Design a binder for this molecule. Structure first.
Ligand SMILES: CC(C)(COP(=O)(O)OP(=O)(O)OC[C@H]1O[C@@H](n2cnc3c(N)ncnc32)[C@H](O)[C@@H]1OP(=O)(O)O)[C@@H](O)C(=O)NCCC(=O)NCCSCC(=O)O
Ligand SMILES: O=P(O)(O)O[C@H]1[C@@H](OP(=O)(O)O)[C@@H](OP(=O)(O)O)[C@@H](OP(=O)(O)O)[C@@H](OP(=O)(O)O)[C@H]1OP(=O)(O)O
Lengths: 4, 660, 149, 70
């Protein structure tokens, strides 16, 4: 998952 | 806006494009368009079928939809303090949203909601203004910590606190004239309202300080009212709290406010836990208010290294208000002439000569021998090491995940300030200057390693490299203090401060060097599973370059290499299984007897240790981690196949071999 | 048979339908296009026969000064095809492209409570490098994994 | 042609209405083959109020109008  | 209509001309000019080409600006640069919303799917936008509730205030509330709203609003603003944005936590309440946009009703006849509930809502909004401009003071991080965006709202900046103190005192003189004329289980609910008003009148006296005695007498009032509130919270059963969550609560209020990010669906905690957070707020605001009795400049340096050793990470308002209370101290001079805070830490720890530093004015004498002959070195060391001690004070108001990587970024600056300190100390790793900056360098390494363990990023088949590195920097720091407390140039007031600091480190080292003997014991009894992929040499060369990456690049202290740390474990793995038990039963016995000899010893008649250093509950938390870890080494000494396990109790620094 | 396919442009509309339903992070359509219009030889797609069972999405830039860093951006499999051995010959096929082109570190961020894909990455050699306090927009923390090949 | 016509619109304000009468007004930036009109400084214009979103995507299975002059 790519965080914000 | 849009005037000329071209829809048919648009849906036949895009369907003539290629497979995956874009008609964009030459300076559009697709990295820019990765924070954009995609409006029509959920979790991106929030305006799908809103219907904004039609609040209709013109209705009298009984004394149970007032008490349930008083608990829903407190539980709403106490979870804005811990994360979640102001929209969809607190602005979703339809009474706060009506003011941040006399009484509530237009036909003002002052019913029992304008007398009672309306001064309560005014105080929650006024409390969320004093807190909000503490959030904008620049001591935290804008998204990891609080989301402090105020969605173009106004938290009554032009409402006087004298009018708010008279509306709110009038609500107590109204409720106390009606306890006597109601029954025996309504009367119970009105006296539960009267504590929630006097908890809000007491929380408000903490936010505006205005003194130091009335903000401790108010923090002793919060700790007494919350146990009397938390037991009468179970009066609103299930269907009063449902018929006001659809009548006076609009959960989707983000659909009419300015969007800065997608909807952070942070899970709530409830009303019973949100009153515990007020007990958590009042318990460590009492700890920070004890930083007015710090009567030295070395105690200020250590109050901030014990503050990051807490096992709860208190609150973003409590953390960010430490910076405002530790500068205004009137015993050390921070925030104006802050280079007298660095020189006072060195005059105490190792002692400066009387022709170099004048302690009655806390500054370097203007024309002396050292500061005029070797000019641009003295003015360079003092400027370089002031920007470390002042920087270390800015780091204590941080979450422990960014307290650590702000200490890692500070290690290339202590390495410079230590190199031009032991070059000045030849003109007077010992001496006045370089023996304190080496102590700050070694306390920074011990806080990088210990917080890398409490962040649970050393998965348990990597303990024996961690516990071998950790007692190698404990061993260097221990033979540095007792070499400095054995000097003759050090002042005798801080000769008994070093040997009190050295007995604390000897109790911490003896309880962490007892875990190297316990991990090797548990790794051969298969309590700690060592998996098949870790025995690759190209993998364990990356395990060591990822954890102990800042410590390898240093040349002082000497780094423990991987091929050297593997010879400590191999010299300890060739013991017997019944001999590793009796060797680890004596290392925790020596750690138990040395930990109780510190927490019951005096250690406070000295001026500058840290008088509040046992209130972080660190030295007694790893005292229980070597007692309950000792009642299972007796079980393991009887049978080597006992079914023990390694538990991860969340209020403890260290895991313990606990179960049966 | 389960094969690994080097991502032609036809599988983009299935990547958005899969990753949106099991990854708790709100990506738009122009987030996938940022990784696959510039680095398309690092992303791979696994098919059952023609069926699109999961995919991986990667990139490889120079990070700050000279460290060429690969970055596993997102990885997921359909729920009916987990546990078999897909997404370990799908992500190893992506770890081989960014190793022959000479990366010096390979990072990725995963969730803290997500255990099924953090005991999976340790099996490939990744270890925890940082902890990110409240990284994602749920208030949940994140670990940053790293591998030095 | 499609690309030269879309390049003339590429910085003027548009008036996308999606399907349930939510009219977005913002600066046009980018599309694709399906219609994925990236808007900047976007305003919501819901039932009776307006938000201040800033950057949106608006896929083209949910586009009812593309009025653009100013
Ligand atoms: C992460 C996955 C894609 C991998 O699952 P998979 O493809 O079935 O795995 P696999 O066949 O390679 O299994 C390999 C290893 O994974 C580990 N593993 C997989 N599932 C589990 C589980 N539920 N619990 C523990 N370990 C597990 C395990 O060690 C296994 O080897 P073994 O079975 O011998 O213990 C899948 O769990 C998944 O769909 N994830 C959900 C979406 C997601 O979170 N993925 C990305 C997370 S990080 C994105 C960024 O990056
Ligand atoms: O992106 P930011 O939050 O601004 O943080 C970045 C960066 O982060 P990215 O990872 O997102 O690129 C690095 O991160 P890593 O690859 O190391 O994760 C970096 O690391 P270095 O210090 O090794 O350069 C350093 O983070 P930190 O400050 O946490 O050490 C840095 O932050 P700054 O640019 O703020 O220094």
């Amino acid at each position: 998952m790519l965080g914000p | 806006a849009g005037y000329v209509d071209c829809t048919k001309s648009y849906f036949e000019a895009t369907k003539s494009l290629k497979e995956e080409q874009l008609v964009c600006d030459p300076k559009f640069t697709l990295l820019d368009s990765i924070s954009a919303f995609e409006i029509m799917e959920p979790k991106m936008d929030s305006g799908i079928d809103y219907q904004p509730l039609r609040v209709d205030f013109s209705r009298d509330l009984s004394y149970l939809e007032i008490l349930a709203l008083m608990d829903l609003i407190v539980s709403a603003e106490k979870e804005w303090h811990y994360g979640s944005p102001l929209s969809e936590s607190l602005l979703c309440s339809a009474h706060v949203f009506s003011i941040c946009k006399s009484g509530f009703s237009s036909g003002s006849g002052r019913n029992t909601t304008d007398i009672v509930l309306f001064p309560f809502v005014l105080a929650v909004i006024k409390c969320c203004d004093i807190v909000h401009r503490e959030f904008l003071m620049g001591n935290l991080y804008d998204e990891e910590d609080i989301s402090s965006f105020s969605y173009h709202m106004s938290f009554l900046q032009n409402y006087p606190i004298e009018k708010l103190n008279y509306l709110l005192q009038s609500s107590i003189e109204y409720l106390a004239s009606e306890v006597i004329k109601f029954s025996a289980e309504l009367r119970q609910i009105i006296e539960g309202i009267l504590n929630r008003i006097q908890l809000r009148i007491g929380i408000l006296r903490v936010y505006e300080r205005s003194d130091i005695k009335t903000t401790i007498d108010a923090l002793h009032l919060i700790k007494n009212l919350v146990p009397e509130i938390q037991n009468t919270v179970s009066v609103v059963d299930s269907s009063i709290k449902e018929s006001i969550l659809k009548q006076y609560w609009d959960f989707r209020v983000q659909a009419q406010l300015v969007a800065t990010a997608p909807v952070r669906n942070i899970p709530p905690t409830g009303i019973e836990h949100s009153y515990q957070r007020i007990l958590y707020f009042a318990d460590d605001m009492l700890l920070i208010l004890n930083s007015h009795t710090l009567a030295s400049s070395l105690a200020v340096y250590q109050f901030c290294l014990d503050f990051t050793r807490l096992n709860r990470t208190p609150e973003p308002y409590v953390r960010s208000s430490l910076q405002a209370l530790i500068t205004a101290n009137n015993a050390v001079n921070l925030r104006d002439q802050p280079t007298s805070y660095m020189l006072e830490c060195i005059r105490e720890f190792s002692g400066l000569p009387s022709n170099f530093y004048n302690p009655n004015t806390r500054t370097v004498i203007e024309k002396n021998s050292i500061s005029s002959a070797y000019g641009p070195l003295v003015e360079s060391l003092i400027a370089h090491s002031t920007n470390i001690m002042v920087d270390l004070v800015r780091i204590c108001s941080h979450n422990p995940c960014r307290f650590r990587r702000n200490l890692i970024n500070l290690l290339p600056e202590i390495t410079v300030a230590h190199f031009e300190a032991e070059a000045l100390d030849l003109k007077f790793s010992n001496g006045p200057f370089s023996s304190f900056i080496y102590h700050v360098k070694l306390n920074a390494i011990e806080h990088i390693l210990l917080s890398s363990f409490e962040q649970k990023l050393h998965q348990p088949y990597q303990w024996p490299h961690f516990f071998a590195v950790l007692d190698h920097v404990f061993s260097i720091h221990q033979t540095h203090l007792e070499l400095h407390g054995k000097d003759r140039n050090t002042p005798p007031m801080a000769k008994t401060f070093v040997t009190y600091l050295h007995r604390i480190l000897n109790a911490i080292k003896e309880t962490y060097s007892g875990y190297l003997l316990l991990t090797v014991l548990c790794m051969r009894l298969n309590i700690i599973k060592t998996p098949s992929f870790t025995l690759d040499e190209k993998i364990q060369e990356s395990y060591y370059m990822a954890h102990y990456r800042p410590l390898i690049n240093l040349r002082q202290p000497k780094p423990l290499l991987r091929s050297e740390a593997d010879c400590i474990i191999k010299n300890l793995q060739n013991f017997s299984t019944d001999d590793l038990i009796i060797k680890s039963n004596e290392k925790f016995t020596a750690a138990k007897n040395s930990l109780i000899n510190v927490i019951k010893s005096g250690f406070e008649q000295n001026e500058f240790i840290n008088p509040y250093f046992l209130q972080t509950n660190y030295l007694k938390n790893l005292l229980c981690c070597c007692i309950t870890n000792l009642v299972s080494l007796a079980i393991l000494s009887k049978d080597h196949s006992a079914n023990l396990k390694i538990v991860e109790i969340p209020g403890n620094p260290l895991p313990s071999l606990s179960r049966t | 048979m389960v094969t690994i396919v080097p991502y032609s442009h036809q599988y983009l509309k299935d990547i958005c339908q899969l990753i949106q339903k099991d990854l708790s992070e709100p990506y738009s359509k122009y987030v996938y296009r940022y990784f696959v219009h510039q680095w398309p030889e690092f992303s791979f797609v696994a098919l059952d026969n023609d069926r699109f069972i999961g995919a991986v999405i990667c990139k490889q830039d120079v990070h700050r000064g000279t460290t060429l860093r690969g970055y596993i951006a997102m990885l997921a499999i359909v729920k009916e095809y987990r546990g078999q051995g897909i997404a370990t010959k799908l992500t190893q096929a992506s770890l081989d492209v960014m190793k022959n082109r000479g990366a010096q570190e390979i990072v990725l961020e995963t969730e803290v409570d997500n255990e099924a894909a953090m005991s999976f990455y340790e099996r490939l050699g990744f270890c925890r490098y940082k902890r990110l306090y409240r990284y994602y927009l749920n208030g949940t923390d994140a670990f940053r994994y790293i591998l030095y090949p | 042609m499609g690309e030269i016509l879309l390049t003339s619109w590429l910085n003027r304000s548009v008036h996308i209405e999606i399907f349930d009468e939510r009219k977005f007004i913002g600066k046009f930036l980018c599309t694709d083959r399906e219609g994925a009109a990236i808007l900047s400084n976007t305003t919501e214009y819901n039932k009776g109020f307006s938000r201040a979103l800033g950057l949106v995507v608006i896929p083209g299975k949910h586009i009812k109008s593309f009025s653009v002059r100013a």
